[PDB]
Amino acid sequence: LELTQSRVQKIWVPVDHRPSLPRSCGPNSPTVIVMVGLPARGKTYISKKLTRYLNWIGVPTKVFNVGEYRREAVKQYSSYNFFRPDNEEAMKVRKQCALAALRDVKSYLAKEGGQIAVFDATNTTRERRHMILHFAKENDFKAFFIESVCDDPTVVASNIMEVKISSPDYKDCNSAEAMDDFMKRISCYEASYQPLDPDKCDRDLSLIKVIDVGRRFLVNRVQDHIQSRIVYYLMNIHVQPRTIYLCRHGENEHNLQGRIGGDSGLSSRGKKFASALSKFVEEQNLKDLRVWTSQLKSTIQTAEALRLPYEQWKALNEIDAGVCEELTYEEIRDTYPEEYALREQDKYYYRYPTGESYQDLVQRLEPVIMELERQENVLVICHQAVLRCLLAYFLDKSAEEMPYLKCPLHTVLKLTPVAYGCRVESIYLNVESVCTHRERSNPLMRRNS
Amino acid sequence: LELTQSRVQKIWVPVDHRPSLPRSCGPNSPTVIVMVGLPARGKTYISKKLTRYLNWIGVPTKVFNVGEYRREAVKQYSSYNFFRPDNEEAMKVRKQCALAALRDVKSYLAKEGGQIAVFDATNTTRERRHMILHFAKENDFKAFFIESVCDDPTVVASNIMEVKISSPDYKDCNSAEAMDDFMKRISCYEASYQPLDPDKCDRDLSLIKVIDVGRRFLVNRVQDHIQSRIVYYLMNIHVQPRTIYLCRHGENEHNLQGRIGGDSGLSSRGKKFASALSKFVEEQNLKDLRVWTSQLKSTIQTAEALRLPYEQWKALNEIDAGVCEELTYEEIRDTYPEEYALREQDKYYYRYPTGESYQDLVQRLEPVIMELERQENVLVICHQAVLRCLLAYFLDKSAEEMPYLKCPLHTVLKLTPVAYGCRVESIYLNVESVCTHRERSNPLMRRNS
Numbered sequence: 001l002e003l004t005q006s007r008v009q010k011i012w013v014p015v016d017h018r019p020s021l022p023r024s025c026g027p028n029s030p031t032v033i034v035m036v037g038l039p040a041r042g043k044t045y046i047s048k049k050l051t052r053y054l055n056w057i058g059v060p061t062k063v064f065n066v067g068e069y070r071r072e073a074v075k076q077y078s079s080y081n082f083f084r085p086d087n088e089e090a091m092k093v094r095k096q097c098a099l100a101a102l103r104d105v106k107s108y109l110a111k112e113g114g115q116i117a118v119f120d121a122t123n124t125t126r127e128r129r130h131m132i133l134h135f136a137k138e139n140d141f142k143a144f145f146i147e148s149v150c151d152d153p154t155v156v157a158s159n160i161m162e163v164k165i166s167s168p169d170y171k172d173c174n175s176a177e178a179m180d181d182f183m184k185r186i187s188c189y190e191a192s193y194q195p196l197d198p199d200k201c202d203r204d205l206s207l208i209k210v211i212d213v214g215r216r217f218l219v220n221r222v223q224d225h226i227q228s229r230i231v232y233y234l235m236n237i238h239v240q241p242r243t244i245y246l247c248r249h250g251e252n253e254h255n256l257q258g259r260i261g262g263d264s265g266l267s268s269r270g271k272k273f274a275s276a277l278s279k280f281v282e283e284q285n286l287k288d289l290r291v292w293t294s295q296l297k298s299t300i301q302t303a304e305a306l307r308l309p310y311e312q313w314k315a316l317n318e319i320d321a322g323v324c325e326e327l328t329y330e331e332i333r334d335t336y337p338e339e340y341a342l343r344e345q346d347k348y349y350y351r352y353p354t355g356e357s358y359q360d361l362v363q364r365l366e367p368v369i370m371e372l373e374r375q376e377n378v379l380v381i382c383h384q385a386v387l388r389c390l391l392a393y394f395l396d397k398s399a400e401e402m403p404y405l406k407c408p409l410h411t412v413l414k415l416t417p418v419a420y421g422c423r424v425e426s427i428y429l430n431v432e433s434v435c436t437h438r439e440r441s442n443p444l445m446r447r448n449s
Numbered sequence: 450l451e452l453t454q455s456r457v458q459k460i461w462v463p464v465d466h467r468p469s470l471p472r473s474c475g476p477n478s479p480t481v482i483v484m485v486g487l488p489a490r491g492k493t494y495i496s497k498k499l500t501r502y503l504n505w506i507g508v509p510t511k512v513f514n515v516g517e518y519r520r521e522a523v524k525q526y527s528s529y530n531f532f533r534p535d536n537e538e539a540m541k542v543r544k545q546c547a548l549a550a551l552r553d554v555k556s557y558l559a560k561e562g563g564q565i566a567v568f569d570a571t572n573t574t575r576e577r578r579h580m581i582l583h584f585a586k587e588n589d590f591k592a593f594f595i596e597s598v599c600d601d602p603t604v605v606a607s608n609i610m611e612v613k614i615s616s617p618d619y620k621d622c623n624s625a626e627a628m629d630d631f632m633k634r635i636s637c638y639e640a641s642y643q644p645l646d647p648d649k650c651d652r653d654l655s656l657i658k659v660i661d662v663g664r665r666f667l668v669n670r671v672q673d674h675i676q677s678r679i680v681y682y683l684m685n686i687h688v689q690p691r692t693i694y695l696c697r698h699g700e701n702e703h704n705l706q707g708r709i710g711g712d713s714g715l716s717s718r719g720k721k722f723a724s725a726l727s728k729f730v731e732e733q734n735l736k737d738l739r740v741w742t743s744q745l746k747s748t749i750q751t752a753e754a755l756r757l758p759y760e761q762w763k764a765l766n767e768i769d770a771g772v773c774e775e776l777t778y779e780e781i782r783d784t785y786p787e788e789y790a791l792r793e794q795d796k797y798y799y800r801y802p803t804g805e806s807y808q809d810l811v812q813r814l815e816p817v818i819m820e821l822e823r824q825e826n827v828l829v830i831c832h833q834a835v836l837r838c839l840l841a842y843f844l845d846k847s848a849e850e851m852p853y854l855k856c857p858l859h860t861v862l863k864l865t866p867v868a869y870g871c872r873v874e875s876i877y878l879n880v881e882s883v884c885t886h887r888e889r890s891n892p893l894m895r896r897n898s
């Protein structure tokens with residue numbers, strides 16, 4: 001009934017005329033995601049990628065890699081002997097590392113505001129999983145299991161060459177021995193490995209078993225929305241090689257005037273960029289390539305120069321500046337001094353009046369991200385704010401830095417999937433344009449001064 | 450480079466100054482969804498619901514129920530004897546009905562603009578499925594299988610009582626005999642039933658096996674985006690009973706002035722409605738109830754009167770009228786005569802300048818629909834256009850009728866899941882308000898007149 005609108009987010013909240021002595025209380029039970037599987041099955045890759053996605057959509061998530069706890073407690077790896085099932089002392093150390101990680105998991109989910117903790121380890125025995133389940137039960141945490149099953153030697157071999165031999169554990173080995181050492185290591189777990197059995201022993205566990213690198217999936221009893229989103233995400237990512245290209249529309253008339261928003265067309269330079277973009281695409285020599293644009297004129301004119309079929313996404317339209325659309329920043333500062341200052345203090349959360357925030361952008365872009373994960377070669381022609389959000393997802397940048405990422409005109413960001421993330425290459429197409437980047441930029445309210 | 454903006458959708462397209470004699474060509478290979486399973490497993494329910502969802506998100510889909518073809522060719526059902534595996538003549542009729550349905554499937558996907566055809570039948574043998582696969586291959590159609598497996602007699606019994614005994618096949622039977630007849634019917638298929646075997650015999654088929662009413666899922670090789678969306682949808686719907694309530698914000702100041710859009714607060718009547726809404730909710734006596742609002746003031750003030758926790762969704766915000774926000778329809782007609790007339794001729798596709806269309810609304814609302822499917826009891830407090838879109842989904846209304854559905858103020862639409870769809874009950878809370886509904890509303894351009 002009597003609400004007030006927050007200045008930054010523009011969210012209507014009930015006015016709480018706190019009493020003489022206001023109370024607070026404070027701070028959807030958190031979830032422990034349990035990775036399961038033999039080594040070199042992509043557990044860490046999945047852990048890191050899923051975590052990159054959850055944080056980007058706004059769900060605070062953290063990976064707890066037992067591997068790093070062991071590397072911290074033992075200093076330098078020598079051989080697979082450390083992992084022999086008959087290595088009583090190492091078995092003890094490994095367990096102690098697991099418990100210390102769970103300790104931090106508990107502190108993360110119950111005291112630091114975390115919502116999803118990804119417990120990244122082999123967890124190959126019912127006994128170990130049972131212990132984690134116990135830990136979850138006693139702390140009131142939900143538990144979801146992700147098991148990667150892969151019995152294709154070609155895949156395991158490739159995985160070892162791609163991330164294991166260059167691992168710090170093998171800093172003193174050459175390819176041949178690292179590979180040999182890792183294979184023996186894997187064999188150590190093979191005898192006691194008890195895969196998840198949703199149809200019998202694990203009927204009541206919430207889980208997804210990822211088979212043959214995402215070829216087949218076995219999903220058992222999803223509990224809530226977050227698990228539902230996780231399952232959807234995991235079933236649409238793949239590891240086939242491809243390349244993702246991101247760039248803004250060629251320079252437009254509004255850019256020349258320093259005006260934000262609008263739907264202006266390409267300037268003479270923007271058009272030169274479009275031709276150059278076509279030449280660049282041509283030279284990349286891609287078998288197939290999907291091209292996506294927003295529904296705003298500038299990105300579409302740019303794609304037209306490619307002479308390739310392209311798809312318009314309303315979700316790729318630049319951030320909506322509300323009542324500030326069509327204005328120069330100078331006019332915003334002069335006409336809306338308060339809004340200008342508010343956005344400068346909280347650029348990620350700030351929402352333009354009757355417009356959007358970077359936070360809204362991210363929600364709007366989720367479907368684009370999901371489809372980008374499913375695709376192969378794709379070129380996305382968009383706008384500044386939109387590109388910053390997309391790049392923040394691929395490069396795992398925080399919400400605080402997202403709105404300040406540098407994404408210049410006439411420049412193509414070439415993203416190639418490698419190891420546990422994305423390698424980024426910048427390629428400026430040598431066509432002049434203005435610069436639209438803007439970096440981040442009390443007394444009388446205390447006595448004497 | 451030289452594009453023109455479509456007047457209705459506001460989409461930039463390349464100007465095609467067609468030559469003296471313009472050419473056309475015309476009209477993503479279509480998909481045949483194959484239902485699989487014993488009778489009373491929810492195949493028709495899933496077929497109809499999935500179809501309701503696809504059409505609503507814009508993917509033309511049609512169900513081909515072989516059952517209806519048989520009811521058309523044989524006139525009146527007598528008993529399960531028709532379905533005996535030793536009934537040579539009926540086996541022939543059934544096959545002929547299948548082929549005639551496939552005939553229509555082919556005509557639907559290849560000549561009528563259809564994109565997804567749902568082949569609804571038992572298709573319990575590898576032999577029958579192999580025939581459909583052949584049909585798909587020769588027509589260049591993709592094939593996706595949905596198999597519902599349920600071995601819980603309590604579920605089958607309930608299913609029979611809920612949709613079979615009132616089926617037209619049993620128009621001359623009482624509950625007891627219809628039930629008995631259907632059970633014998635099911636037994637007819639049990640000997641030859643060959644479930645999908647993704648791990649062996651059906652390794653190469655794209656499929657989802659729905660187990661224990663959505664408890665567990667087995668998914669094998671999704672081929673494209675549409676199959677991906679279908680899988681996601683199927684894994685989030687359930688059949689637990691619950692109730693969905695939809696209503697608009699109580700009457701607001703803009704409503705009183707006949708102004709569209711804006712973010713005005715509740716009028717004195719709107720506030721009375723809010724109190725009445727609270728009384729109504731209270732009397733419904735719901736164990737638990739989730740309450741969702743948009744981020745606009747009026748829906749939030751309304752929810753505040755409930756004294757229940759509620760969740761704000763930016764996706765529930767009323768359609769954005771762009772440059773027409775805050776205007777009365779009179780002012781729109783006078784200031785933007787052309788826009789006014791264009792919207793009247795194509796209300797579903799028409800997009801306001803720098804604003805939205807009902808088509809955009811639907812895309813914006815997909816996540817709300819998906820989450821509504823996952824939830825139990827939910828009350829959604831929204832706005833006129835938004836409510837029309839939501840209602841169109843639940844009541845399977847077309848895009849053409851969607852923008853004209855009647856959704857009056859101070860009125861609660863109570864939706865209860867029954868049989869193959871949703872029963873709708875209207876409950877006006879007896880509080881006056883204005884009416885915001887507006888129904889649908891050459892010569893000189895031909896010689897003499």
Ligand SMILES: Nc1ncnc2c1ncn2[C@@H]1O[C@H](COP(=O)(O)OP(=O)(O)O)[C@@H](O)[C@H]1O
Binds near residue numbers: 044212214
């Ligand atoms: N579902 C999967 N099955 C098998 N390998 C995968 C899967 N997903 C990713 N990978 C691959 O696994 C590698 C990363 O493996 P890593 O995560 O270190 O394995 P692990 O943590 O299980 O010991 C990458 O080369 C990646 O392409």
Ligand SMILES: Nc1ncnc2c1ncn2[C@@H]1O[C@H](COP(=O)(O)OP(=O)(O)O)[C@@H](O)[C@H]1O
Binds near residue numbers: 486599688
């Ligand atoms: N996955 C499922 N498993 C079992 N029953 C289901 C499922 N989904 C829906 N139902 C139920 O099945 C009934 C509809 O069955 P129907 O579609 O006529 O079966 P069929 O077409 O297989 O002969 C409804 O009562 C519905 O609640």
Ligand SMILES: O=P(O)(O)OC[C@H]1O[C@](O)(CO)[C@@H](O)[C@@H]1O
Binds near residue numbers: 255260321
């Ligand atoms: O988020 P920032 O730093 O204010 O830049 C936003 C602007 O960038 C632009 O794409 C201009 O370069 C505008 O259309 C948009 O409003």
Ligand SMILES: O=P(O)(O)OC[C@H]1O[C@](O)(CO)[C@@H](O)[C@@H]1O
Binds near residue numbers: 770
């Ligand atoms: O789609 P319609 O029939 O133009 O009605 C749309 C309008 O309904 C309203 O909710 C007013 O009742 C406006 O805010 C919105 O613009």
